[PDB]
Amino acid sequence: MTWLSDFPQAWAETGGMGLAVRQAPLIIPLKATSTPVSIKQYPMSQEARLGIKPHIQRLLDQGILVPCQSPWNTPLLPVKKPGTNDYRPVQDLREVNKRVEDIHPTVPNPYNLLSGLPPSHQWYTVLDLKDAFFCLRLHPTSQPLFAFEWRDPEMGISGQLTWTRLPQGFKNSPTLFDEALHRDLADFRIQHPDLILLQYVDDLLLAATSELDCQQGTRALLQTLGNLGYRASAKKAQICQKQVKYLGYLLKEGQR
DNA sequence: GTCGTC
DNA sequence: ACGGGACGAC
Numbered sequence: 017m018t019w020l021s022d023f024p025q026a027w028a029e030t031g032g033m034g035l036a037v038r039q040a041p042l043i044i045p046l047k048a049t050s051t052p053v054s055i056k057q058y059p060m061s062q063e064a065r066l067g068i069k070p071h072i073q074r075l076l077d078q079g080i081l082v083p084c085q086s087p088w089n090t091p092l093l094p095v096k097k098p099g100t101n102d103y104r105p106v107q108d109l110r111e112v113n114k115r116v117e118d119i120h121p122t123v124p125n126p127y128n129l130l131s132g133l134p135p136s137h138q139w140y141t142v143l144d145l146k147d148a149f150f151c152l153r154l155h156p157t158s159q160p161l162f163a164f165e166w167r168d169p170e171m172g173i174s175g176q177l178t179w180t181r182l183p184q185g186f187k188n189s190p191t192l193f194d195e196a197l198h199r200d201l202a203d204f205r206i207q208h209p210d211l212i213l214l215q216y217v218d219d220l221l222l223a224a225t226s227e228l229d230c231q232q233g234t235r236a237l238l239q240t241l242g243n244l245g246y247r248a249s250a251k252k253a254q255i256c257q258k259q260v261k262y263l264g265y266l267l268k269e270g271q272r
Numbered sequence: 273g274t275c276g277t278c
Numbered sequence: 279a280c281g282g283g284a285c286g287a288c
Binding site: 093095107109110187 | 287288
């Protein structure tokens with residue numbers, strides 16, 4: 017874990033919530049005929065509400081969510097993941113997605129992305145960017161679009177809240193993030209010709225020919241990511257392994 | 273709680 | 279065919 021110490025700012029664990037400082041706040045273009053839609057918030061049980069509350073509060077403290085009055089409104093859903101009885105906020109942005117202008121999907125499919133890994137580079141590092149979408153600011157003009165209602169019995173919010181960052185459930189988030197990070201890591205690729213860097217939204221794979229080149233490469237990548245404002249999961253990081261898990265594949269001896 | 277789909 | 283009903287997707 018000497019890496020955790022050498023790169024404080026790069027790990028989600030010690031660098032705090034990220035923010036892509038080099039990326040201009042995103043403006044989300046609407047379809048030519050779109051008009052705001054305000055969907056009714058169906059009553060939520062106290063159990064769900066209590067489970068969600070801490071997440072909402074944390075996001076408010078972090079500034080990711082802010083109060084607002086908007087012509088738009090979509091449902092907030094209480095979702096117990098892994099069948100487990102733990103609730104987390106899930107916004108139904110389907111009506112918003114329908115009204116936002118489409119963009120060409122530029123994220124490669126994992127199968128094709130992996131085809132770009134030579135047998136020569138067998139030293140790997142896998143990094144997962146934490147709260148990736150949240151690292152990208154949303155332009156003030158586009159924020160109203162993702163509003164939802166938030167109710168709390170004692171001293172909280174009085175109406176709607178919305179995101180100041182690219183949100184979950186928005187049809188174009190994966191693509192916009194992949195493109196933004198590609199722009200931010202363009203220079204790194206240029207400064208490290210001998211390194212292979214695969215990008216799949218927030219799932220990164222760095223490939224080197226030698227253990228040391230992977231150590232040096234990994235150090236530089238972590239340094240760059242931290243400086244750019246992104247955060248990698250230290251808990252999940254797979255640093256300089258000749259065998260790693262990436263996008264559902266088990267990379268070993270140049271296999272898969 | 274909806275809602276598109278195999 | 280044509281449509282009630284499981285999956286999972288937001």
